[PDB]
Amino acid sequence: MIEVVVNDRLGKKVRVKCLAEDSVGDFKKVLSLQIGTQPNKIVLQKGGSVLKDHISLEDYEVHDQTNLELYYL
Known part of the structure; x- marks a missing residue:
């Protein structure tokens, strides 16, 4: 974890x-519970890069104590 x-x-x-x-899809589902933005209106960014549910967090390189960006779309 x-x-x-x-x-x-x-x-x-x-x-x-x-x-x-x-995966980013499951990540947006867990985050959507706190922000209340739904998994269809959440956009994550990793160093100027859009994260998608079709790609896993390991592909974008997401580890513990990492920084992620949020967007509403």
């Missing part, structure tokens, strides 16, 4: 835990 932080450009800093093998 790892702990990653998500900061929205609009103004929403929420933290959420997951796994490096966990």
Whole structure:
């Protein structure tokens, strides 16, 4: 289990835990519970890169204590 932080450009800093093998789709589902933005209106960014549910977090390289960006779309 790892702990990653998500900061929205609009103004929403929420933290959420997951796994490096966990996919972005499951990641948005767990985060959607805290932000209440639904898995269809959440957009994650990793160093100027859009994360998609079809790709796993391990592909984007998401580990414990990592920084992630949040977007509403």
